[model samples]
Target: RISSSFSFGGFTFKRTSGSSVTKEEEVLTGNLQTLKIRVHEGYEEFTMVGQRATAILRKATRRLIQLIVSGRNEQSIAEAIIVAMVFSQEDCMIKAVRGDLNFVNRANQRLNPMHQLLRHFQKDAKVLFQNWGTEPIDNVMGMIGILPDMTPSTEMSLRGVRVSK
Candidate 1:
């Protein structure tokens, strides 16, 4: 009996059946970011707008800021929808804020980014959710943690640092 199985050509083993891959299909390894992409796809199931998107964005921003400031990998369930909602909202907000997204008669583009982001999310939810497979999301989560809701906990605060003698 052959102790090992080998292919003369480049051999790759993969699972492509069942409602989901079996536990043995854990050969693929990744971090949290990849998982986020998949979650974003899942987010499209609900119509996110105005308060919904904004709320999610606020939470994401807080976490992202924490991730940037501190170099750490902490995992948490921020959920994929939060990522998609916030980014799309930010994209539109950025376009509007930077004046990049302008229309005829000085009208600005709105809702388009949200719609596109959501549609893109639904088209490939699995792919989008995969982004969270990276550690970045968790690190951020550790830094900021989860918010009760997407609303701002406190107003933006700016304080000048004083040098001590």
Candidate 2:
């Protein structure tokens, strides 16, 4: 009834056994500037039972943002691409969560793998706000400590900031 998602690269990763948070720390432990040949994998075989997808996307965004702040070039690019993919996926998952369609019939829903990941990314971003840490934003990179929007990222969609290409 549910289609699974998988990825083999980037800073974020998932596993079939549990939530995406399991692998969130791996991104933080790495040397931001080092170029390493490691393939991280994540997979989910069922439609999310909870807000797991959102949690995943939110965590990924924080990780990528951190990577960018460290001045890591190649890795940062990879993280950005992954972030895009994940964000799009989150869009679809949100629709499902809102009762727009029956999730049980999602086998042929025609979605990008990144959809679920991004949903997770967005969700986790909100969680960060509920439990903000002075250290992550103050001690290191001075990043935004709050979610600008409730459901999606609006920082790049507004004018005078990031324009459409």
For lDDT, the strongest prediction is: 2
lDDT of candidate 2 over 4-28, digit per residue (tens): 5544232333333423322212211
Q: Which ten-residue region of model 2 has the weakest summed lDDT?
A: 156-165
Estimate candidate 1's alpha-carbon lDDT, on a 0 to 1 scale.
0.24
Considering summed lDDT, which 10 consecutive residues are worst modelled in model 1? Answer: 156-165
Quality of model 2 by C-alpha lDDT:
0.27
lDDT (0 to 1) per candidate: 0.24, 0.27
Each prediction's TM-score versus the true structure: 0.23, 0.22
How would you encode candidate 1's per-residue C-alpha lDDT over 1-165 as one tens digit per residue?
742222211111121211211111111112211111121211111111222111111223212221111111111122233333334332222222212221222364353433433434334334333333222122222233322232111222111100011
